[PDB]
Amino acid sequence: MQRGIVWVVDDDSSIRWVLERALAGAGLTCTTFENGNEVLAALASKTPDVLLSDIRMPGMDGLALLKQIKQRHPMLPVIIMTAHSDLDAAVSAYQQGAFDYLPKPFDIDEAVALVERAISHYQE
C-alpha cells in the first residue's frame, strides 16, 4: 500500500508549509500544525499514522503540549526531535510510550517513510 499520514507539530504558520513542501515530492500526508494543542484539536478523534514534534519555538520553553498529544489519541507511534528543553515532555516516553528521540541529520522522506514502516512493524 505504501503512503502514510504524519501529523507533526511545528511552531508558527509558514513552518508546516515548508515541510509539506519537501513532503509533496515524496507524496505523503505530512499534516503539520502550529501548536501541539491545536494539533490534537484536529486529531481529537485519533492520529492517522504517526505524530511528530520539532524542538524549535518562540522564546524559551519547547512545545509544552507534548504530554497533551498523547493524553488525546492513544500512544500510537510518534517521534520528538532531540531538543534541549523538551527532556521534560519526553520523560513520558520510557513510561509506557511509543516514540524515541530523533537526532540529526534526517531527510524528510527518510524520517516520514521510516515511520511509515514502524507504524506497521511491531504490532504483536
- Residue 113 CB contacts under 8 Å (≥ 6 apart), including other chains: 4, 26, 28
Question: Cβ distance 89 to 114 under 8 Å?
Answer: no
Cell of 20: 509539506
Any idea where the domains of the chain sit in the sequence? Answer: 1-124
- Residue 61 CB contacts under 8 Å (≥ 6 apart), including other chains: 85
Method used experimentally: NMR
Which CATH number applies to 1-124? Answer: 3.40.50.2300
